[PDB]
Design a protein around this ligand. Structure first.
Ligand SMILES: CCCCCCCCCCCCCCCCCC(=O)OC[C@H](COP(=O)([O-])OCC(O)COP(=O)([O-])OC[C@@H](COC(=O)CCCCCCCCCCCCCCCCC)OC(=O)CCCCCCCCCCCCCCCCC)OC(=O)CCCCCCCCCCCCCCCCC
Ligand SMILES: CCCCCCCCCCCCCCCCCC(=O)OC[C@H](COP(=O)([O-])OCC[N+](C)(C)C)OC(=O)CCCCCCCCCCCCCCCCC
Ligand SMILES: CCCCCCCCCCCCCCCCCC(=O)OC[C@H](COP(=O)([O-])OCC[N+](C)(C)C)OC(=O)CCCCCCCCCCCCCCCCC
Ligand SMILES: CCCCCCCCCCCCCCCCCC(=O)OC[C@H](COP(=O)([O-])OCC[N+](C)(C)C)OC(=O)CCCCCCCCCCCCCCCCC
Ligand code: SF4
Ligand code: SF4
Ligand code: SF4
Lengths: 182, 186, 42, 156, 315, 78, 105, 201
């Protein structure tokens, strides 16, 4: 790892700023595309709409970020039932062999950009039914997954930590800078 | 007080057992509640009274919710105060692991110790059940307090021996405090 | 010490259904509506 | 645990019996909060879902204190319970159970005797006594129709 | 004919459209905020400062996502429903009572009934062109409830026009100079709230566009800008129903700031019934729209026929 | 390491779940592992009458019926 | 009315321009077989209903009936009072008797 | 081949499939001009031998595994030769464009400078990829016929069974079919060697 910086060292460090790219771009067109990508990523991270895809027990914790203690609504996060209106699909439960074409069709009808959160050990790696005859060995064999939330029923702080990690990934998305360098 | 349709016994309680009242005062009361939305007015007032209540939103991550000293989180491998690793490769944790996440391969070290050459826990397979820390004769494997360990990539949740030893080095104070405050319960 | 109830026991935990206070009466509601609309017509 | 203990002929102590009874009743309230919230979300009233899931999160905090997990406690074992109760757990359970009845009354003030909830829940899916007896119904589906069968009293 | 009348009418109408659209965005913010406060939970926060640019976070996201289609070959009929929906929601506002003259609508109630009668048309083309059985079911259910309370709404507003003696909306101001019509028309106030939550799809009448019995009624295949235009059109319909409640029952008070405070309060009431009530059924809603509200409409229309004849002899 | 030796035999216990009657038909062969553990879920028998209850009802009626059946499909699918 | 045509055409033009710029601003990805599919929940996939058609017909009959209730607010100060009252009471009373008869049968 | 001597050079002719630049390019609205497709010499002069993407992927893997394919050029072409007019007419028969109310018409491209002006403006105004791939390089690529070289190996020497066109292409163009007007398709005619020599004479 790295040691987290001591406050004597960290007082000499300057402020990071909001932009992961920095304001030190050379060209004015590159700087304008950087700020446009910053505004676009702020709009995308300011409201991600996850889809009501609750397969198994993990989803009982998924409603617990809907719950008044954790309150996902002040993070841009609000559930949508239709897959067209939703940004994120949260695979929260056990993907089985009869569940595989349904999950693939629901993911394919979702419009791009598409970030996928694997909630729980049945969602990533198979988990407690990994050696079962009718359980897919994780959802990574079917749906491409950006965030993997570890706990068997993830606490709801850990699922919301996965949500904040997805927001940091969305804030780190480089589209217009790649277009300028394509 | 309406009469009972079914006589209620001693050990039971009956719902929707009241007779519908037929005197004119109760009929006018039910009629006014139907016409002028009195029960809907009570529902609206009860709803509006919860705006003035305190919000229970705990403002993550500046303020985090309550936990317990028994809490099951990231598995981690502890060490002795002298510095030697605690895990004697005795393999009760892998025998008791119900999802069979733990893989142990052991060889004799140069000084003759039993300590492991491979200790892998598949955290995508681990169900965080805590059977390994109960089945550990020494206090080697332990459930750490950490649960903010979501990964970008599937392979990064395949925990090696070095990752578990680094988790034991990083989280030693809180794990030792929980084990000091929890060992007499177990 | 073990996890035990205090001496004298706990207090009585409420479980019954208490209704909210209903100020209105149906004859009173109908009569007040009639009086209010009779003033309003004038 | 009762299956394995009846196979093993093992009698649990009385404190384990009382702990399992109290956590089975806490579990019963958690299940019926989930049932009422899911039914109210399916009917349409989305407010008692959150109003009762705050209370559900308080009992999941109680499960977390007693076992270390918010759910799937792995706490009841064949032969009793896995761990002893922590000190001061009942001093929170009593305060919580004293506070729960007002939240119950606040849920019935918006769900019970609201005419839309009655229109979505009255004379709908009528199950007779011979229907529930012949079709293998159990629990509330027996006791909605009038059968007095509760397994906590008939076979304690 | 004097050209500054055309210039100022154009400027006032465009300013009305712009302010209605920004008030739609802040109404979505208000609904997400106080609808959270209906329960214990908080509203939006943590975006910008105190959650204020959250609808702009919605608008940047919805105008960037991939415009997907319910079929790949021909999808121009998919486009024409949010265009006409937002056009009607921004076009219905021209019959607002403006005291400084913008449009001299001597028949404003008929204009409102016309735009409400097109609401069925935009939701019918929303349902059919989305190529799904859920979409057709939601479109048929929305057309059913909106034409079921169209007749009731026409009779209720027709009973209200008997009070002012004409169809001019500004004539609601002169007959409210001593008291509001909330005092005289309180069962009509409850019936008009039940009407205004039926033409615009809200939670008490939500079998058309709910997330329980259908996943979505006619927004099921609409996304990435079409859903944004549909959402803005529906919240503009909510704002129009709040204004039209505040003109008829509460005193028109167009200039006073208390009129717009009451308009925000009736929007608060619309979000207050959003969180409270459950959803009606198809059979119970056919019972409500064609028997109870129709019988009340005809009966209390007879009451105002008798009352306007009785005052005509006395005056 | 290896579980406690349960004597060989069959039993069926059943308690009052909040859903209904939760039953375990546990049959042991004398080893450290169970030979058979059949689970009676009450939601399976509650869901088996949905075909007769749901006929001649409306769509919101059926939505309220699964809303009031108190089914959880983890134990139904076992 | 001529200003209403101009402002309605301007609202239509502004909404079509906003949707065209939204279609330009929408992120263009590779089109797919399954993405264009109509959404049925999960696994991939109505006849004429007479009850809804008679609902539309009842709506039409009552709409044309309301279109004769509409003028009489203006006519009340410019007509014979006895004739106006007889026609209004007879009109709404026959409507109420027909509604109650169709309810009972 | 000057830098890496043992480099395998697979030469595809024109690769068809899903999300391609052949069937999607002939499937787009921006390629057509008032329900009529311009083609160079009406599509009759050019003969194309297209290959599937799974066949060339299997050829790439069979070249990577077998080490006798070092520095050998492999002509990646399909099983049978087709001319472009019959291919485009077969595609429009698959998309149900053969109905008389649609107004399908095939005409000469060299008489139409408006189509090339549209292609140049489409290459100009698009910031990223042009819509439908209507850059003039694709125009010259569809103008150039597919010529195989004798004595240079074909993918059947790499041990892959080439999928025929009529099995795969109706599955690709099944979502591309038009809505039926309110008022099985014939397979296309292959071009042999002697018919191609008669056509090019
Ligand atoms: C093409 C041109 C570019 C187009 C795209 C622009 C994208 C802008 C957004 C973005 O992502 O910027 C990141 C980008 C990177 O920022 P950074 O340098 O990494 O972070 C700055 C600090 O290190 C870290 O920030 P900070 O900690 O300094 O706080 C930022 C900001 C405080 O933060 C904000 O103001 C955030 C916005 C809150 C809005 C709340 C009300 C919303 C109402 C909606 C209706 O601070 C101030 O504004 C200074 C203090 C103001 C005190 C006011 C007291 C009032 C009483 O930001 C900039 O480049 C900033 C300059 C450009 C932005 C526009 C400035 C002119 C217009 C100002 C408003 C006029 C009205
Ligand atoms: C052309 C217009 C370009 C500016 C559009 C407005 C962008 C405002 C913005 O993103 O602010 C939020 C972001 C910051 O908000 P944020 O949403 O990234 O984070 C909120 C902060 N926490 C999470 C800690 C609660 O502002 C900036 O990055 C600097 C804004 C400078 C001023 C821009 C115009 C404001 C009007
Ligand atoms: C209130 C309503 C507000 C509506 C607008 C809200 C957002 C406004 C601020 C953000 C503007 C974002 C513009 C770009 C949007 C599309 C992003 C994208 O993927 O671009 C890829 C495209 C092409 O890049 P490419 O090469 O990666 O695309 C190839 C296709 N894929 C993605 C499959 C690989 O980028 C551009 O075309 C560059 C555009 C530069 C100018 C942007 C607009 C400036 C004026 C505003
Ligand atoms: C698309 C049309 C959407 C529905 C529009 C309904 C308008 C009401 C019907 C009608 O005839 O209105 C007369 C009204 C005229 O109402 P009026 O004549 O009673 O008002 C007098 C005119 N002012 C207010 C200026 C003094 O005309 C319109 O509404 C014109 C509609 C133009 C539609 C353009 C797109 C087609
Ligand atoms: S990962 Fe654990 S909590 Fe989640 S669905 Fe699987 S068993 Fe249930
Ligand atoms: S039970 Fe403990 S000491 Fe034994 S092998 Fe496992 S971690 Fe090591
Ligand atoms: S907590 Fe349970 S699943 Fe995880 S390593 Fe320990 S025994 Fe295995």
């Amino acid at each position: 790892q790295q040691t987290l910086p001591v406050a004597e060292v960290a007082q000499n460090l300057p402020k990071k700023g909001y932009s992961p790219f920095g304001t030190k771009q050379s060209s004015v067109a590159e700087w304008s595309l950087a700020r446009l990508d910053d505004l676009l990523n702020w709009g995308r991270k300011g409201s991600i709409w996850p889809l009501t895809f609750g397969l198994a027990c993990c989803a009982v914790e998924m409603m617990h970020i809907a719950a008044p203690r954790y309150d996902m609504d002040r993070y841009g996060v609000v559930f949508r039932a239709s897959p067209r209106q939703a940004d994120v699909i949260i695979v929260a439960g056990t993907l089985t062999n009869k569940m595989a074409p349904a999950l693939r069709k629901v993911y394919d009808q979702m419009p791009e950009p598409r970030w996928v959160i694997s909630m729980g050990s049945c969602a990533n790696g198979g988990g407690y039914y990994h050696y079962s005859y009718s359980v897919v060995r994780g959802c990574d064999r079917i749906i491409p997954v950006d965030i993997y939330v570890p706990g068997c029923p993830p606490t709801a702080e850990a699922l919301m930590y996965g949500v904040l990690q997805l927001q940091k990934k969305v804030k780190r998305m480089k589209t217009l800078q790649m277009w300028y360098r394509k | 007080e309406p009469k009972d349709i079914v006589e209620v016994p001693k050990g039971y309680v009956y719902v929707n057992n009241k007779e519908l009242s037929m005197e004119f005062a109760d009929i006018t009361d039910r009629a006014a509640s139907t016409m002028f939305f009195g029960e809907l007015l009570r529902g609206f007032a009860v709803t509006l009274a919860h705006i003035f209540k305190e919000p229970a939103t705990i403002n993550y991550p500046f303020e985090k919710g309550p936990l317990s000293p028994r809490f099951r989180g990231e598995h981690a491998l502890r060490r002795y105060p002298s510095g030697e690793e605690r895990c004697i490769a005795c393999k009760l944790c892998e025998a008791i692991c119900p999802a069979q996440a733990i893989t142990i391969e052991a060889e004799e070290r140069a000084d003759g110790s039993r300590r492991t050459t491979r200790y892998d826990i598949d955290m995508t397979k681990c169900i965080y059940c805590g059977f390994c820390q109960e089945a550990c004769p020494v206090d080697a494997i332990v459930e750490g307090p950490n649960f903010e360990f979501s990964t970008e990539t599937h392979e990064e949740l395949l925990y090696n021996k070095e990752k578990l030893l680094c988790n034991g080095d990083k989280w030693e104070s809180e794990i030792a405090s929980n084990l000091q405050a929890d060992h007499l319960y177990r | 010490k073990q996890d035990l109830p205090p001496p004298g026991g706990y207090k009585k935990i409420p479980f019954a259904r208490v209704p909210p206070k209903s100020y209105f009466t149906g004859f009173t509601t109908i009569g007040t509506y009639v009086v209010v609309t009779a003033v309003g017509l004038g | 645990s009762l299956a394995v203990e009846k196979l093993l002929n093992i009698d649990v102590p009385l404190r384990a019996k009382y702990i399992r009874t109290l956590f089975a009743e806490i579990t019963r309230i958690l299940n019926h909060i989930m049932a009422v919230g899911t039914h109210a979300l399916d009917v349409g009233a989305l407010t008692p879902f959150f109003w009762l899931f705050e209370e559900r999160e308080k009992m999941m905090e109680f499960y977390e204190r007693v076992s270390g997990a918010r759910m799937h406690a792995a706490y009841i074992r064949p032969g009793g319970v896995s761990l002893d109760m922590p000190l001061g757990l009942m001093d929170d359970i009593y305060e919580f159970a004293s506070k729960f009845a007002e939240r119950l009354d606040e849920v019935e003030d918006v769900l019970t005797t609201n005419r839309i909830w009655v229109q979505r829940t009255e004379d709908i899916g009528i199950v007779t006594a011979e229907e529930a007896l012949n079709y293998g119904f159990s629990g509330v589906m027996l006791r909605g129709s009038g059968i007095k069968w509760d397994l906590r009293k008939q076979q304690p | 004919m004097f050209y500054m009348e055309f210039i100022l009418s154009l400027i006032g109408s465009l300013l009305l459209i712009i302010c209605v659209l920004v008030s739609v965005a802040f109404l979505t913010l208000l609904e997400r905020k106080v609808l959270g406060y209906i329960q214990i939970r908080k509203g939006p926060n943590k975006v910008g400062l105190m959650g204020i640019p959250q609808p702009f976070c919605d608008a940047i996201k919805l105008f960037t996502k991939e415009q997907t289609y319910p079929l790949l070959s021909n999808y121009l009929s998919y486009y024409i429903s949010p265009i006409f929906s937002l056009f009607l929601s921004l076009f219905v506002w021209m019959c607002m009572p403006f005291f400084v003259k913008l449009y001299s609508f001597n028949l404003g109630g008929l204009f409102f009934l016309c735009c409400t009668s097109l609401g069925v048309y935009t939701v019918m083309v929303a349902g059919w062109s989305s190529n799904s059985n859920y979409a057709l079911l939601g479109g048929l259910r929305a057309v059913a409830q909106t034409i079921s309370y169209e007749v009731s709404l026409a009779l209720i507003l027709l009973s209200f026009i008997f009070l002012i003696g004409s169809y001019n909306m500004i004539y609601f101001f002169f007959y409210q100079v001593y008291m509001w019509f909330l005092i005289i028309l309180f069962p009509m106030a409850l019936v008009w709230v039940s009407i205004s939550l039926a033409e615009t799809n809200r939670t008490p009448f939500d079998f058309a566009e709910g997330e329980s019995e259908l996943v979505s009624g006619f927004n099921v295949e609409y996304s990435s800008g079409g859903f944004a235009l549909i959402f803005m059109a529906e919240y503009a319909s909510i704002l129009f129903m709040s204004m039209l409640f505040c003109v008829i029952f509460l005193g028109c008070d167009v200039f006073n700031l208390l009129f717009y405070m009451k308009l925000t309060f009736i929007s608060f009431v619309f979000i207050w019934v959003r969180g409270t009530l459950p959803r009606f059924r198809y059979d119970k809603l056919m019972y409500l729209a064609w028997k109870c509200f129709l019988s009340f409409s005809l009966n209390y229309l007879l009451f105002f026929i008798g009352f306007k004849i009785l005052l005509f002899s006395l005056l | 390491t290896q579980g406690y030796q349960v004597p060989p035999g069959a039993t069926y216990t059943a308690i009052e779940a909040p859903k209904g009657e939760f039953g375990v038909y546990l049959i042991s062969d004398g080893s450290s592992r169970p030979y058979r553990c059949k689970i009676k879920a009450p939601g399976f028998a509650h869901l088996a009458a949905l075909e007769k209850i749901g006929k001649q009802h409306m769509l919101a009626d059926v939505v309220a019926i699964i809303g009031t059946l108190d089914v959880v499909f983890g134990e139904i699918d076992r | 009315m001529f200003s209403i045509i101009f402002i309605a055409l301007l609202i239509l033009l502004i909404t079509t321009i906003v949707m065209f710029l939204a279609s330009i601003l929408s992120k263009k990805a590779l089109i797919d077989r399954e993405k264009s599919s109509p959404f049925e929940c999960g696994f991939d996939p109505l006849p004429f209903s007479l009850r809804f058609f008679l609902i539309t017909i009842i709506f039409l009959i009552f709409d044309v009936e309301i279109a004769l209730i509409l003028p009489m607010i203006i006519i009340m100060k410019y007509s014979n009072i006895m004739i106006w009252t007889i026609t209004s009471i007879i009109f709404i009373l026959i409507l109420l008797i027909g509604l109650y008869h169709e309810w009972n049968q | 081949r000057d830098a890496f001597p043992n480099a395998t050079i697979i030469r595809p002719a024109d690769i068809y499939g899903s999300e391609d630049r052949f069937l999607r390019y002939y499937a787009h609205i921006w390629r057509r001009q008032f329900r009529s497709m311009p083609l160079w010499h009406k599509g009759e002069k050019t003969v194309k031998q297209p290959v599937y993407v799974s066949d060339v992927a299997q050829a790439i893997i069979n070249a990577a595994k077998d080490p006798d394919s070092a520095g050998r050029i492999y002509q990646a072409v399909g099983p049978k030769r087709y001319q472009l007019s019959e291919l485009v007419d077969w595609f429009h028969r698959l998309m149900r464009k053969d109905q008389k109310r649609w107004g399908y018409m095939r005409y000469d491209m060299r008489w139409d400078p408006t189509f090339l002006l549209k292609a140049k403006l489409n290459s100009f105004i698009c910031p990223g990829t042009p819509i439908g791939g209507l850059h003039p390089a694709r125009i010259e690529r569809e103008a150039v016929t597919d010529k195989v070289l004798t004595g240079v190996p074909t993918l059947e020497d790499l041990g892959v069974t080439l999928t025929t066109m009529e099995q795969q292409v109706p599955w690709e163009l099944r979502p591309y079919r038009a809505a039926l007007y309110y008022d099985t398709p014939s397979p296309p005619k292959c071009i042999e060697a002697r018919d191609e020599l008669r056509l090019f004479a």
